[PDB]
A paper describes a structure:
An X-ray crystallographic structure of 0638, determined in its external aldimine form to 1.3 Å resolution, demonstrated the manner in which the UDP ligand is positioned into the active site. Crystals of Pcryo_0638 were grown in the presence of PLP and UDP-2-acetamido-4-amino-2,4,6-trideoxy-d-glucose (the product). They belonged to the triclinic space group P1 with a complete dimer in the asymmetric unit. Given that the crystals were grown in the presence of PLP and the product, initial inspection of the map suggested that the external aldimine was bound. Even after modeling the ligand into the map, however, there was residual electron density calculated with (Fo–Fc) coefficients. To account for this observation, a mixture of the external aldimine and PMP was subsequently built into the electron density with each given half-occupancy. The uracil ring, however, is sandwiched between the side chains of Phe 335 and Tyr 229, which is contributed by subunit B. There are two additional interactions between it and the backbone amide of Gly 337 and an ordered water molecule. The side chains of Tyr 229 and Lys 215, both contributed by subunit B, lie within 3.2 Å of an α- and a β-phosphoryl oxygen, respectively. The C-2' acetamido group is anchored into the active site by the side chain of Gln 183 and a water molecule, whereas the pyranosyl ring oxygen lies at 3.0 Å from a water molecule. Whereas both enzymes function on the same substrate, the manner in which the ligands are accommodated in the active sites is remarkably different.
Author numbering:
A (entry chain BBB), B (entry chain AAA): 5 to 399
The structure:
């Protein structure tokens, strides 16, 4: 197999062992989560961060703080992991699907505007695979129509939009550190970021059974039982062992982004000849007029077949099989039409017509791995498999 | 300070280090959670178990599977941690408080029956401190009124009721492994247990984004993208590092229950002379005719002041102060009237009048530690602090 992702180091194993043997294992008995919060906020260009159990709970707590619920429409992408949509359903709101950009796979200002109604309250925009959304256009639309924006940053650690971290631009950023993500806190983890003090206080309470931050930290208490629960909430906390991994990985992020970026550019460079021959489309953020001064996180590397130009005996799926047969990982990538899941049967939530760009990218995507442990030889194998298979197509 | 709880061993540190370095860190990339589920189910006398992020999410997923929501009343206890009540509020149902037993601190068949209505659908009974509820009475009452029962077992690992593990008697058992609990999976953790296959399938899907167990494991899959999400759900999963701790601690539970029991017996025995003198009430499960062939988990050890028999210069609160001043941990214990929290302001959820037994136990409780790391000498010091302060009261 190729070099693993995730790939935990002895430093990380020693850190979790130390946290465990300290017995200071909980948000309320140690300081690892609290220091991870302040370090993550600084790293993500945000005033506030809160450590969460996972990226789904991060979306959930953001929707809770924004008072999104029954009768509110929230614009969502069809091209993502289901949590980016089901979080909206689970709070009782109505997800409404926008189509995506043919180059980036993200929802766009134009496709969001097309599905806005007088009931739209929110947008959950996903920075898919690490390519940032057009946040100037999305925030302009949100200002015009009085909408709240949640940036789903689960695939986008290290991405920037015109000089600032993703997750710092919308009202709230939601983050995952699940097992194969760019940051990976020991099996699960998440985070929210915000610049709004009131949204921070609301999310902080909600993930801690409705403990008021003001009651805990900003109030003088008599000895004995303390009355802290000033609203209803739940347990969406992270452990100390997950947090110490997060803190370690923040310090690695420049290295990790640089390695992902180098791996991606080697693969995109090799795909260019097959774009010239008409078999691939190879969108590159660094060559985009509209994503000047932005950076791609490179969670995963997408290119797209030009189906019309493949011989009849070839297809996207056959290319995946042939690259896999040469020992190189290759996938169809993200779900592109999550609304086709049976969860949407009889809900009235499925678009009445399939979203054409989302449908096309589901059919055309080829997805490659670029994670930081991949060796020069593994990236060479990747390039050689692409050249081998497309040379077979070309003859 | 007294011996710590929790108190993680080198064996546990080495196990979490091995899980991390394996890179098999997630429910979907390793087998520690799946083996913990089957071992926990067997240990807890249940056909099915599902690993959960925490005991709050265990309650939440049980209420989801039972289709409890808007317009449904659920009987709850006032004498617990808020999650036993706020889980009901958060799913949209109406918590209705029952008073508690003066000896055991648990809701009783009599006090539950007093607050039943035709809209009651469920009971969340807490085995407080490890003393099992009257499950014959509660299940009889649930049968006659067509109610579902959730056992909140967060404080009750090792408790049995007439030969059976707690958590195996109600429709669903909810469990916590939070940091100071009898089992403590490295900062957070939870579990549900059930004997009902359909409730198991529903909870298993809901904690995993609505992945159907049938779609994942009972369906032959074509190559490429698999359509699994047949209903809506969320991410309420446990990590592999938490699960390996759970598996280790299950094997220690005979020893841990025996040590907690021996510690409790020594303290209760010392309290007997002060009960004889009228200063304490010392309920003992092993002496209760109603709790024959049952066993106490001994999460914490409660006795109760007889307020009426204390001299004017004395109080429950002064006894706590004086025992702590001798170097012995002592607490007022569980919240006894959770409905007094400001979360309940303007909800209409407060009982018309304060619940009198619950109010009394909040005023009279003295709670001592009995966790398995406490040495013979620390238990001796506990007895001597009790004897010193009560000898002062007497003389
Ligand atoms: C355990 C784990 O690693 N889960 C990650 C994984 O989810 P998974 O269940 O495989 O979902 P899908 O990618 O829809 O795949 C469905 C099925 O098709 C198969 N498949 C998939 C792709 C493919 O190319 N080929 C294929 O055969 C899969 O093997 C699986 O059998 O892939 C997702 C993209 C990740 N995304 C999470 C996440 C959250 C939620 O964060 P959280 O996981 O709660 O921290 C929030 N927003 C965003 C934009 C997120 O990305 C999940 O964390
Ligand atoms: C981080 C941690 O260890 N939390 C545990 C702790 O909750 P805590 O926030 O302290 O809540 P309370 O006991 O109501 O105390 C409120 C305040 O008064 C203070 N206090 C409390 C008691 C006292 O004697 N003196 C005092 O000064 C506390 O320090 C705090 O400042 O004490 C609770 C009893 C535990 N209960 C858990 C659990 C779940 C929920 O499971 P989960 O915690 O989500 O796994 C579900 N059902 C059940 C029957 C559960 O037991 C919590 O796990
Ligand atoms: C530091 N960062 C803005 C690139 C995340
Ligand atoms: C049933 N028991 C093994 C938990 C005692
Ligand atoms: Na109903
Ligand atoms: Na009823």
């Amino acid at each position: 197999p190729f070099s693993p992702w995730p790939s935990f180091t002895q430093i990380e194993a020693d850190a979790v062992s130390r946290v465990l043997l300290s017995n200071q294992v909980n948000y309320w008995t140690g300081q690892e989560c609290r220091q991870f919060e302040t370090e993550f906020a600084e790293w993500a260009d945000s005033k506030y961060a809160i450590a969460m159990g996972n990226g789904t709970l991060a979306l959930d707590v953001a929707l809770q703080a924004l008072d999104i619920g029954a009768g509110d429409e929230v614009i969502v992408t069809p091209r993502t992991f289901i949590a980016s949509i089901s979080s909206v359903v689970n709070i009782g709101a109505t997800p409404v699907f926008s189509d995506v950009d043919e180059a980036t796979g993200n929802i766009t200002p134009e496709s969001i505007a097309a599905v806005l109604t007088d009931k739209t309250k929110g947008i959950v925009c996903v920075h898919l695979a690490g390519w940032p959304c057009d946040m100037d256009g999305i925030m302009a639309l949100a200002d015009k129509h009085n909408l709240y924006v949640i940036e789903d940053c689960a695939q986008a650690h290290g991405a920037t939009y015109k000089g600032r971290s993703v997750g710092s631009i919308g009202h709230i950023g939601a983050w995952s550190f699940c097992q194969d993500k760019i940051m990976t806190t020991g099996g699960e983890g998440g985070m929210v970021t915000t610049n709004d003090e009131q949204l921070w206080r609301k999310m902080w309470a909600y993930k801690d059974h409705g403990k008021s931050y003001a009651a805990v930290y900003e109030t003088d208490h008599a000895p004995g039982y303390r009355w802290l629960h000033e609203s209803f909430g739940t347990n969406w906390r992270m452990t100390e062992m997950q947090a110490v991994l997060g803190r370690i990985q923040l310090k690695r992020m420049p290295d990790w982004t640089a390695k992902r970026t180098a791996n991606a550019q080697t693969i995109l460079d090799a795909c260019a000849k097959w774009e010239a021959k008409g078999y691939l489309s190879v969108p590159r953020l660094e060559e985009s007029v509209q994503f000047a001064d932005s950076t791609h996180a490179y969670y995963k590397l997408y290119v797209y077949v030009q189906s019309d130009n493949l011989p009849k005996e070839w297809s996207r799926d056959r290319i995946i099989r042939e690259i896999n047969d040469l020992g190189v990982p290759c996938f169809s990538g993200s779900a592109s039409e999550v609304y086709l899941e049976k969860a949407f049967d009889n809900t009235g939530l499925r678009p009445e017509n399939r979203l054409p760009v989302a449908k096309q990218l589901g059919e055309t995507s080829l997805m490659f791995l670029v994670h930081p442990t991949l060796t020069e030889d593994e990236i060479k194998q990747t390039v050689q498999a692409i050249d081998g298979v497309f040379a077979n197509i070309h003859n």
